[PDB]
Amino acid sequence: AGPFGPRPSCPSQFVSAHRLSACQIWIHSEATSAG
Amino acid sequence: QQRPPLLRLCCTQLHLQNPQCTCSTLRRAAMATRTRQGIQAASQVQRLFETARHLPATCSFSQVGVCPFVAIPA
Numbered sequence: 001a002g003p004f005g006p007r008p009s010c011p012s013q014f015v016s017a018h019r020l021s022a023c024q025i026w027i028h029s030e031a032t033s034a035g
Numbered sequence: 036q037q038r039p040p041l042l043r044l045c046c047t048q049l050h051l052q053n054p055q056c057t058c059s060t061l062r063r064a065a066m067a068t069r070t071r072q073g074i075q076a077a078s079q080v081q082r083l084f085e086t087a088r089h090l091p092a093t094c095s096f097s098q099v100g101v102c103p104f105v106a107i108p109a
């Protein structure tokens with residue numbers, strides 16, 4: 001690791017990825033199918 | 036068959052993240068859905084978090100696999 005490594009910033013990637021909004025809809029769809 | 040279009044979109048979004056961020060961000064996404072939608076029935080809450088933890092597999096994050104279980108909030 002070092003100051004010039006890739007240094008992922010997970011919260012920034014999350015917002016850049018639209019907060020995984022399509023995953024959220026998918027998770028919601030699967031959740032309400034329980035039982 | 037090809038996958039449901041919404042699932043494919045989810046994988047496109049997940050691919051915008053590094054493998055070592057996927058499980059943390061999917062936990063965040065699961066909490067966001069659970070709270071925004073007011074999901075409280077026990078089996079629905081369990082299936083919500085389980086579905087989130089299994090997404091890296093279908094989205095081909097082979098180095099991640101299934102995200103580890105973490106006790107569900109509230």
Ligand SMILES: [Cl-]
Binds near residue numbers: 036037038039
């Ligand atoms: Cl299909």
Ligand code: NA
Binds near residue numbers: 012013014017
């Ligand atoms: Na990013």
Ligand code: NA
Binds near residue numbers: 066067070
């Ligand atoms: Na919350």
Ligand code: NA
Binds near residue numbers: 070072
């Ligand atoms: Na609500």
